[PDB]
Amino acid sequence: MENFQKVEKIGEGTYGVVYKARNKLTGEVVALKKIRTEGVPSTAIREISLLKELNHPNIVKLLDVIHTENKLYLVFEFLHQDLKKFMDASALTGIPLPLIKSYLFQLLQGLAFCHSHRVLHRDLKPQNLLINTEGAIKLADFGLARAFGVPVRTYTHEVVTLWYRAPEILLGCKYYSTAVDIWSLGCIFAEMVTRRALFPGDSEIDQLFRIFRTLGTPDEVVWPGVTSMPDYKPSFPKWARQDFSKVVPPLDEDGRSLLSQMLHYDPNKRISAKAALAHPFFQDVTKPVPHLRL
Numbered sequence: 001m002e003n004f005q006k007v008e009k010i011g012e013g014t015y016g017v018v019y020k021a022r023n024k025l026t027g028e029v030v031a032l033k034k035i036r037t038e039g040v041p042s043t044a045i046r047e048i049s050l051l052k053e054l055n056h057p058n059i060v061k062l063l064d065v066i067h068t069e070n071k072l073y074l075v076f077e078f079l080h081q082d083l084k085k086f087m088d089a090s091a092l093t094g095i096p097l098p099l100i101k102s103y104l105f106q107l108l109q110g111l112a113f114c115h116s117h118r119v120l121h122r123d124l125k126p127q128n129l130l131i132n133t134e135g136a137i138k139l140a141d142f143g144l145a146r147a148f149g150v151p152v153r154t155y156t157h158e159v160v161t162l163w164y165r166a167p168e169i170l171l172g173c174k175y176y177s178t179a180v181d182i183w184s185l186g187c188i189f190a191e192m193v194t195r196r197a198l199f200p201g202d203s204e205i206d207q208l209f210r211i212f213r214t215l216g217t218p219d220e221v222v223w224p225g226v227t228s229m230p231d232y233k234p235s236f237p238k239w240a241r242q243d244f245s246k247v248v249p250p251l252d253e254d255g256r257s258l259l260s261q262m263l264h265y266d267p268n269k270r271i272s273a274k275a276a277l278a279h280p281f282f283q284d285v286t287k288p289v290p291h292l293r294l
């Protein structure tokens with residue numbers, strides 16, 4: 001590394017390999033993501049560079065965009081653990097409700113900030129939510145999707161997770177809205193509560209049908225325009241909706257109410273991050289200290 005000192009290979013994300021590195025100068029520890037191929041659109045580097053200006057306590061800071069030797073590196077502030085690992089570690093006992101609430105509240109603040117600045121995430125999942133010992137949780141990878149449209153997969157044979165994809169994306173809609181992030185966060189909220197993924201689809205159609213089996217096959221009544229979506233087929237089976245009391249037990253009515261608003265089929269009826277923050281579910285929100293083993 002011309003300037004860094006690779007500590008370890010954290011992983012291999014959807015846009016390239018990730019390393020924990022120490023800036024031999026500043027001495028700071030950061031996450032270095034090497035972006036995928038043989039050109040790199042200058043349009044992307046400009047859009048990405050804009051993301052450097054985004055500053056919010058619940059958004060992982062993009063410290064630098066390095067375009068040298070014709071390669072693309074993203075330098076991010078470092079956090080020791082992601083929500084996926086934390087949920088696994090908390091599987092036996094479950095994440096306490098007060099902490100689930102704190103995390104959801106913080107993530108909505110982060111989304112409200114991004115959305116008011118016209119930035120969408122598009123690929124929220126537990127792995128993209130980072131946490132620290134102080135009880136904070138932050139969104140990682142905001143805006144990278146748009147600055148790269150949709151490259152389908154990661155870069156080198158790796159099963160793309162569809163579990164958190166909004167139905168409008170699954171139905172072929174070409175224009176994503178802020179609502180896709182609320183849907184993903186709703187799925188994550190449910191998973192923290194039940195300790196099981198809400199919609200663990202194994203294919204795009206299995207994903208769509210798992211959603212339909214739980215929330216009911218959508219129709220023009222609940223989702224005006226759904227039958228005209230690019231990938232909608234009149235041959236879709238028609239399943240009846242289940243009750244939330246059965247979907248995320250034993251979550252209370254405040255929680256079920258908020259979740260139901262985050263999972264409305266019509267992107268336009270789906271609650272905004274701003275509005276969700278005012279929901280009664282957050283009346284008693286606090287900021288608990290999580291039990292992190294690093």
Ligand SMILES: NC(=O)c1cc([N+](=O)[O-])c(Cl)cc1NCc1cc(F)c(F)c(F)c1
Nearest residue numbers: 010011013018031033076077078079080081
């Ligand atoms: N900003 C970041 O801090 C970070 C970034 C990316 N990434 O995509 O650019 C990834 Cl993957 C993991 C990250 N940390 C969480 C983490 C740190 C570890 F040190 C570790 F071992 C682990 F599993 C998870």
